[PDB]
Design a protein around this nucleic acid. Structure first.
Length: 54
DNA sequence: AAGCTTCCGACCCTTTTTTCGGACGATTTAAAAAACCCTTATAAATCAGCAAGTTACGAGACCTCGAAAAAAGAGGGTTTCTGGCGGGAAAAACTCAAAAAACGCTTCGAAATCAACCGGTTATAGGTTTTCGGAGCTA
């Protein structure tokens, strides 16, 4: 459950892509990037504004 | 003489190592404080077993919190067991057809027959014993 390995393929010239991930996919995003900082503080205060547009 | 390229000195900034100083701890030494000894006849403690009254120490219990262990829950993965669907081959129904084969007409006269009872025939249900086929096994 702790395994998190990402494999990137350089297609040559200007392009590269993500082939596969082994283990916890949540440690990477779709393009294979990794978050740089993590917090449990309540950033992104969704509670403040609501969708009742009318 | 000019442009390009390469060293070199000067400097700026931060990190890494060394040195020095300071502080703290430990030990040693010296000084100060508490204590010990020497004089006491008289006053108070020693103690004998048991009664009568009291409690300082032990045991029991519960709570409280914190941590540890275990169990559960989650997620990663692989192996296999089953079900559904698709595809090719064989079977058998379905469709098309002929050629027999039966049936009817239709037989007056020739068998067929049932009945009970005896002895005799023999197909074979059932059981008993046994080759053939396959088990794979092993390099």
């Amino acid at each position: 459950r702790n395994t998190a390995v990402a494999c990137h393929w350089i297609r040559g010239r200007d392009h590269s892509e993500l082939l596969w991930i082994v283990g916890d996919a949540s440690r990477f995003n779709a393009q294979g990037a990794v978050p740089t900082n993590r917090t449990c503080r309540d950033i992104l205060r969704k509670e403040d504004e609501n969708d009742w547009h009318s």
